[PDB]
Amino acid sequence: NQFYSVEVGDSTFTVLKRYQNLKPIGSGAQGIVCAAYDAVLDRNVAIKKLSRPFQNQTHAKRAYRELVLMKCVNHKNIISLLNVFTPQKTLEEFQDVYLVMELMDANLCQVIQMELDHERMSYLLYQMLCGIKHLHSAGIIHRDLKPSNIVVKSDCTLKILDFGLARYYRAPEVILGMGYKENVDIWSVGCIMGEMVRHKILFPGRDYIDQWNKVIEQLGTPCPEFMKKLQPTVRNYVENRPKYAGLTFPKLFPDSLFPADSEHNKLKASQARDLLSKMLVIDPAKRISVDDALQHPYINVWYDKQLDEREHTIEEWKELIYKEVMNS
Ligand SMILES: CC(C)(C)NS(=O)(=O)c1ccc(-c2cnc3cccc(Nc4ccccn4)c3c2)cc1
């Protein structure tokens, strides 16, 4: 005990007395997050309620990954865990997990709405690449980066909110069910950057199939060598489609979208387009690496024991998560 309940959205948060003035913030698509005052720390914090951690295998794996990686990862561009708790006293009774994190000011959705500047943008992308690089060195490949799981303070420091997969920003190979590697996450960063420039989602598929049409309408049909890596049913569909030439990157991202009328501006316009052209590459074999995008002229101005293999039963996930909850 020392718990009380407050209604938040359609659910009930039960939290430690220390966390006061619970207020719903951002998208709740991946669990409800509240802003709160922590009276013990005397600071504001964010509290996420995990959404039905034991509804199934998928939810439980995802709950385990998120909690474990959030305890174990420590990096300036990755959200910090402050606390973890459950209102329930025993394993039998155990159903809810709460993560308390440092509070940021907004997600990238709100920053994309505002006008574009080069210095801000390259700083946001730099930090995105630092976070992603740090994840990759730890063996973590995300796969589901998007503006609403990236958060920012008013000073423009950026943190990645989550750890992704145990849709508009998804790499071609992920969507098409082929192998994936590190640079899967480069595709998502290209989508976000392009959207910072267009202020429009680049690839708005009104379904999972139309999505693909939107990609190659703008970028063009990939080479036959890309299509040879697809499973039979997917290759069939992909290669027997009207061939698209796509648009060049200057057409995809016109002069009117960028600051103009200074040598500096026209330079940064080209450096941004150039970067865009190496991130938004359908074939992962041809797409720039994280190390390379960080060394890119647009960005480099800023240079200075846990099961992922196995399936488990819900009860074994419950115990694995619970002990993770109880041991700090
Ligand atoms: C927090 C109270 C006590 C209400 N006043 S405040 O000035 O400290 C403050 C209020 C709201 C936010 C706020 C609003 N919208 C957000 C949308 C997405 C992500 C956020 N930050 C966040 C989201 C998840 C995990 C960690 N940080 C948001 C914060 C930040 C400070």
Which residue pairs from 264-270 have beta carbons closer than 8 angstroms and sit at least 24 positions apart in sequence?
265/118, 268/118, 268/298
Who lines ligand 1 at CB under 6 A? 21, 23, 25-26, 33, 35, 37, 44, 46, 79, 101, 103-107, 151, 161
Q: What angle do CA 306, 186, 231 make, to 5 degrees?
A: 80
CA–CA separation, 212 and 315 (whole Å): 39
H or E stretch at 231: none
CB 263, CB 105: distance < 8 Å: no
Is 33 annotated in a binding site? The answer is yes
CA–CA separation, 187 and 168 (whole Å): 11
In sequence order, what are the beta bridge partners of 34? 24, 47
Hey, what's the torsion of the CAs at 235, 240, 243, 247, to 10 degrees? Answer: -40
Based on C-alpha coordinates, what's the Rg of the chain?
21
Which residue pairs from 207-215 have beta carbons closer than 8 angstroms and sit at least 24 positions apart in sequence?
208/167, 208/175, 211/167, 211/168, 211/175, 212/172, 212/175, 212/176, 212/238, 215/172, 215/282
CB atoms within 10 A of CB 259: 15
In sequence order, what are the beta bridge partners of 78? 160
Domain edges within the chain: 3-105, 106-307
CB 180, CB 169: distance < 8 Å: no
Report strand pairing: 32-38 vs 19-24.
antiparallel
CA–CA separation, 213 and 85 (whole Å): 45
Architecture of domain 106-307: Orthogonal Bundle (1.10)
CA atoms within 13 A of residue 104's CA, in its CB half-sphere: 26
**Percent helix, strand, coil in the chain (nearest 5)?**
40, 15, 40
Closest CA to 211 of 252, 168, 254: 168
Dihedrals phi, psi of 100, to nearest 5 degrees: -110, 125
How does 51-72 read in b/e, with b if 16+ C-beta sit within 10 Å? bebbeeeebbbbbbbbbbbbee
Elucidation method: X-ray
118-137 vs 184-198: helix axis angle to the nearest 10? Answer: 160
Class of residue 161 by CB neighbours under 10 A (exposed 0-12, middle 13-18, buried 19+):
buried
CB 262, CB 255: distance < 8 Å: no
Q: What angle do CA 27, 33, 39 make, to 5 degrees?
A: 145
Closest CA to 170 of 152, 187, 153: 187
Structure tokens at 43: 């600071």
CB atoms within 10 A of CB 30: 17
* 261 carries an active-site annotation: no
CA–CA separation, 172 and 212 (whole Å): 8
Dihedrals phi, psi of 149, to nearest 5 degrees: -105, 20
User: Which residues lie below 8 Å from residue 295, measured CB to CB, with a gap of 6+?
Assistant: none
How does 313-324 read in b/e, with b if 16+ C-beta sit within 10 Å? eeeebbebbbeb
CB 71, CB 325: distance < 8 Å: no
Report how far ligand 1's centroid is from the alpha carbon of 103 (Å). 6
Hey, what's the torsion of the CAs at 188, 29, 51, 321, to 10 degrees? Answer: 20
Amino acid occupying residue 128: M
Closest CA to 197 of 114, 302, 289: 114
How does 113-137 read in b/e, with b if 16+ C-beta sit within 10 Å? eeeeebeebbbbbbbbbbbbbbbbe
Structure tokens at 107: 């997600």
Residue nearest to atom 22 of ligand 1 (CA): 104
Q: CATH assignment of 3-105, given 2.30.30.100, 2.102.10.10, 3.30.200.20, 3.30.950.10?
A: 3.30.200.20
Given 10, 38, 105, 144, the catalytic residue: 144
Residue with tokens 């303070």: 153
Top mutation candidate among 103, 148, 149 for ligand 1, by most atoms within 8 Å of CB: 103
Residue nearest to atom 1 of ligand 1 (CA): 35
